[PDB]
Design a protein around this ligand. Structure first.
Ligand code: 0G6
Ligand code: 0G6
Ligand SMILES: *[C@@H]1O[C@H](CO)[C@@H](O[C@@H]2O[C@H](CO)[C@@H](O)[C@H](O)[C@H]2NC(C)=O)[C@H](O)[C@H]1NC(C)=O
Ligand SMILES: *[C@@H]1O[C@H](CO)[C@@H](O[C@@H]2O[C@H](CO)[C@@H](O)[C@H](O)[C@H]2NC(C)=O)[C@H](O)[C@H]1NC(C)=O
Lengths: 159, 259, 259, 159
């Protein structure tokens, strides 16, 4: 269509349109519903543009584009054929940050510990964090395992 | 695990074996991350187009082993599940985007010299080690070769197996298949030039891709075995679930559990 | 249509403006294959993900025009619809496979100098002309550039526009996009070195891709403007419905519509 | 799954399995149902294997696998995730030939006409075909098109 709307930018992030149908060609569920408000009950959404009724939105900032929720079970959502501008980014491995967890409260700043630092509370996570990674018959027993050496030579480089 | 060597008794103590009770069948693998919660590839529990959808009563877990068969009377710890959390947006329709799950033991297992939790990376160490060219380890009892004449029996590693695999450049990563590689995945494996072989084949899903931190010399889990096209195929590089990105979810689930 | 000139009055008498009666707006192009049937791209009438579902009573046709606006009082011919025959397996959910429709006019239009039909290729001439390197034309009132600053008014050709694009090796085509290309799809455009731009831009869908024969010098319709990424992007190629491969269907549809 | 059924060759051509689902994770219509009986009625289903109930079958020799009908309208069909063998063949342009149309009845052989051949009956197809491809203000008037020549040296080639 020539006389259609303009080219949707920023991978549909700031999208505030009204399309309520998926690429699969399916309906769409009410952002705030008995189904969709339980699936959302775990993620890390963001404002930018509201979750108006049931129109495709990109709340989580999903880089593949705006989507609808199609049903209730996990993975039952689907993307929208929003007609985005440019092809998506290709963040070279650790090129895309992923500003990770806080000590159960956003923004560290006053962050100090012994030499490890847990991030799971202990009450629920259980036990073993404090000394994870340290295999008993090796790191604790100060003996190296057969190929560790090889894993190591990679790090610092051979060229 | 293709072209890999046997694992040493005691090597990876977070290596969990997740298998369905009846019939008794090895499904995938996983990692113990604490005394009570377990991480595994979501597709191991649910995959709609193939009609896969096990529930808790369907499968048990087995921590602390070596041979993918033979009750190791002393060292193991057979235990039932309780929770089973799959990601609300585990894109199973298109490209296994967020192939992360998160099981819970029924009762906290007890630690041992063979049963010990791996570490969930943090932003800092996650920065320093996530660089194309460094290597890692993907373990498991998944198939040795990628085919067999008759009976897959003939392609199932006896003991555990291990292979050290190197991280590739996201560019060449994208370049191995029209399957949309997502922001939160990462392909690892050798290059066509490079000479060395090795790859986590079928059956390997869930098994972790752990990396040793020179600082603090602890073991961390960067990824999880998720998807790939065949095994050791010159050209194709295996893919893994980027656990670091999904870590914020893991937090959001685990501490919401009551207290 | 991009980087292409204005078409000579009468250069392509089979050209079909397909537009909706209300609100009045240009929809797509298409082609006159007989005095009563017209061939067009399917995604002009149907594309659910967008809300595209026009019935016969929704859109009219204009055979014989020139300027994409101005009632051509002496030459055009606005008629009514009858059929709208989409393909049963028109893959609108994934890659617009078989993007081919089959409009039927209410009453057989009066042939003329300015309104003449185009031919469907035959297995012989077909094998002959579809070689990577040969050229063909594509006609359309569709957009000149790919964008505008404000209002697409500032990019819509005054009159019918034309461009000749050369066929490209399927192998290169694949390389062009992640979007799975099918047996019945064929890309045409110049490569990054070659130095000649040009292409069917948005709004050109339906207009035919036609070549002339080196035997019997008649004009044949090899494709149907279907899809593409942007308009005139170096490194990409426009894709067209392979009309020939779908020729057998047309025969079924038409020839079973009565006697 | 490791112990799973063997590989699926020929892109699922002669596949007689019983999976009633689609990659979009949906149901699957019975091949001889009202809906599915229609959509197919006008295509070209060769045998290869039976159309068994509503199991994913590749009845058209679709070289992208086997599939289901998910509804009744055009395009309401979906491919199945059969887990095929090797990478599908990519025929060089005309390389996927296509043995198109007979004189409405199977095979040609005894076929001879003037210089064209209205592969369309006249009755249902209508008027035109005969003098098709010839423009009133050009070839019929033996006058050349501004670029006809350019389109011509194409077949001649500059190498
Ligand atoms: C479930 C895991 O055991 C397994 C890992 C083995 C993959 N191969 C390599 N070299 N890592 N995962 C799979 O087999 C997944 C399950 C879904 C299909 N699949 C694939 O790898 C397909 N071969 C490719 C694919 C299909 C659908 C969606 C994404 C990828
Ligand atoms: C309907 C036609 O006017 C139009 C033709 C555009 C062709 N472009 C070039 N450069 N030759 N078709 C389309 O726009 C098709 C229909 C659906 C949207 N679409 C596209 O080509 C999208 N830009 C991309 C796409 C989406 C889904 C499936 C395939 C392609
Ligand atoms: C996997 O199995 C569970 C059964 O335990 C299914 O859960 C039910 O799903 C339906 C449909 O979404 C809901 O209406 C029920 O309330 C669910 N019951 C429970 C106890 O959760 C789940 O849908 C199955 N998944 C698939 C894809 O079939
Ligand atoms: C497009 O609109 C037409 C309106 O005619 C829809 O046709 C109806 O579709 C339903 C559902 O498939 C059928 O049960 C009716 O019998 C159809 N009626 C007619 C007159 O065809 C059609 O389904 C719509 N298509 C889409 C994709 O929305």
């Amino acid at each position: 269509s020539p006389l259609l709307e303009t080219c949707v930018p920023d991978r549909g992030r700031e999208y505030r349109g009204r399309l309520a149908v998926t690429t699969h060609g399916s309906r769409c569920l009410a952002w705030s519903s008995e189904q969709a408000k339980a699936l959302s009950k775990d993620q890390d959404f963001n404002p930018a543009v509201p979750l108006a009724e049931n129109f495709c939105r990109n709340p989580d900032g999903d880089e593949e584009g705006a989507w609808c929720y199609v049903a209730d079970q996990p993975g039952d959502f689907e993307y929208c054929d929003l007609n985005y501008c440019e092809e998506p980014v290709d963040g070279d491995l650790g090129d895309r940050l992923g500003e990770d967890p806080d000590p159960d409260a956003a923004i560290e700043g006053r962050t100090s510990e012994d030499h490890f630092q847990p991030f799971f509370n202990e009450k629920t996570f259980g036990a073993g964090e404090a000394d994870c990674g340290l295999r008993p018959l090796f790191e604790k027993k100060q003996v190296q395992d057969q190929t560790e050496k090889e894993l190591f030579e990679s790090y610092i480089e051979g060229r | 695990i293709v072209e890999g060597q046997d694992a040493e008794v005691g090597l990876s103590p977070w290596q969990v074996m997740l298998f369905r009770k009846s019939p008794q069948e090895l499904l995938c693998g996983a990692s113990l991350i604490s005394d009570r919660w377990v991480l595994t590839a979501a597709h191991c529990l649910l995959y709609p187009p193939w009609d896969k959808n096990f529930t808790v009563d369907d499968l048990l877990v087995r921590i602390g082993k070596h041979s993918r068969t033979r009750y190791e009377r002393k060292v193991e710890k057979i235990s039932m599940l309780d929770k089973i959390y799959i990601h609300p947006r585990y894109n199973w329709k298109e490209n296994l985007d967020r192939d992360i799950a998160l099981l819970k033991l029924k009762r906290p297992i007890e630690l041992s010299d063979y049963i010990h939790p791996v570490c969930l990376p943090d932003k800092q160490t996650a920065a320093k080690l996530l660089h194309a060219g460094f290597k890692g380890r993907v373990t498991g009892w998944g198939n040795r070769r990628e085919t067999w004449t008759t009976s897959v029996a003939e392609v199932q590693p006896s003991v555990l197996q291990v292979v050290n695999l190197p991280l590739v450049e996201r560019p060449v990563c994208k370049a191995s298949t029209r399957i949309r590689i997502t922001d939160n995945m990462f392909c690892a494996g050798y290059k066509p030039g490079e000479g060395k072989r090795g790859d986590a084949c079928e059956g390997d899903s869930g098994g972790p891709f752990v990396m040793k931190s020179p600082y603090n010399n602890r073991w961390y889990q960067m990824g999880i075995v998720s998807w790939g096209e065949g095994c050791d195929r010159d050209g194709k590089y295996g893919f893994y679930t980027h656990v670091f990105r999904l870590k914020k979810w893991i937090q959001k689930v685990i501490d919401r559990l009551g207290s």
